[PDB]
């Protein structure tokens, strides 16, 4: 799967065929040709195949709070088969076993995977006392903390990962995003060096693989919050292997509007450049100017952004969630990754009820891969 | 009046009665019995009694602007009899001498107390000139300063205390609190190192001696301002002899409601603990949790607050004045102290129009104590 294959083979084959003389059209501009095919590499990178393999080498414990949900169940089978992770499912053990039989999956409880019963667990008194000490001043009474552990699955898995019993967690298949996130933020805590949280959704597009943030965490992020979201996204995408091409999208194109939304972007651009100059980023720009290099070079010759951009940053969540939701059905491709939570101290992600099984599979993998490091 | 009397005598008697054998019911928990005795003596305290004695030791000069008002005159008599302070009443001498006779009081002008006539005074030229130099930049012309020295008695007394002719002043029996306070603030100035003022009103409650903060001065306090109010009050309560137990009240119970008011309180708790970690204080909480320790230990066991809390700091003036009014009618007895003004350099206090004659006597003695320091 090495991307460099088409980089060296196709030119070298072309150079020997011109020396052999059987070629009808000489590509005299070999360096331009080299630029053309390296661009094809850069647009389509799988960025999942290395992830899966890394998960296979070191599977980790992942808790899925909504264990009864059928989509979770379908993904648990593929996780056990591919040897990606050690799945811990939370829910009523009786309904899971019945649905497994109806689904026909070969996973066997206590063998292939472990189950934690939400209604009864020996580690109950310890857990509610642990959750209460975090949430006593945040409006959770002792009596409330108990009731939460019996009926809120997401809270149960959060306590495990913080304790150390579980390595990571994947939730959000049932419920609104902010319900699960609220649980996550108070329990795990912000990662050191960060004071804001970022959500990222990825769509393979004609322009290539493309990422969008922030989709659910912040409804109206301020300037410094955008800058921190940008830097984390550049770090995460560099891990995937795709070099980061950041574009701060806005209705204004390089100062066409002086309204506060555009002013917020420009300030963040200066903030990002001062914190880490290496990142390739230019803003603000129209949406189209970030993908078609032809349009951007006409508005901005000396733009530091080169080629189609892959990290599009949004001024407010509404523009993001409406863009990503409209593109997911206008691309019609493999799911790649879903809502990637950035900034949390522990390896956690929250999904949507519309999330497919492949998305849950891919996302559980992504988390196992995060858990290998500390 | 020594509080330590009941704490020591009763246990030794109890031990002697058990050794004698006449004790029908033994008390095995002697250390618990001491705790119940010490809690009773802290609740029913008489901080006013030492204040009178300290005032008797060194009577100081006190100015009362409303010398014609009947309630002040009754209080001048009992002050003269007690020997607490040397009164300097202000008003028309004829109306005072005629009311003195009408009220059947044995006080003579020029000997027991001193009258300063507002309409005519030898030092008139120095007073309105000094007032002008203080208020020339706050909208007071020379012509306005003259009429103001004759018309507003509170202005007259404020000038005296700043000159040093009188050691303190008590006012407010007629008129709005702020009519005198604004004069007090501009003339005396803020206490060194203090940039906001505080109004404290004391009540005798079943739970114990109880004070409320910011009853009249600030409609809405900054978190910084709330902090300085709390810190000053605990210092003043320590002067009375009561142990400072502080509680920040709010409509939210320990983060149950996230609003501007609750956020405002919590920030102050941090600000107070940094400036003085020794002060026992916890918030935010409901009122009942501040008084009934049982309720507080059930929602917050680790609370640093121990027992009934004596210093109640409130979020806004509106809730504080409403509470104080509704409590002074539902608490049977207790003349205690009137509205206490904190943060002003020269010793002074502003009273309510409905302040009882006992409250004028008490608040005059409180001022004499304050004048003995610096």
UniProtKB/Swiss-Prot annotation, chains A, B:
Region of interest (Phosphate acetyltransferase), residue spans: 46-374
Protein origin, superkingdom: Bacteria
Domain notes: The-C-terminal phosphate acetyltransferase domain is responsible for oligomerization, and is responsible for inhibition by acetyl-CoA and activation by glutamate, aspartate, and glucose-6-phosphate as shown by its deletion. The isolated domain does not catalyze the interconversion of acetyl-CoA and acetyl-phosphate.
UniProt record similarity statement: In the N-terminal section; belongs to the malic enzymes family.
Function: Catalyzes the decarboxylation of malate to pyruvate. In vitro, shows malolactic enzyme activity in the presence of NADPH. However, it is unlikely that this activity is of relevance in E.coli, which produces little NADPH.
Note in the entry: Cannot use NAD(+).
Subunit structure: Homooligomer, possibly an octamer.
Protein name from the UniProt record: NADP-dependent malic enzyme
Organism in which the protein naturally occurs: Escherichia coli (strain K12)
Portion held of the full protein: 384 to 757 of 759
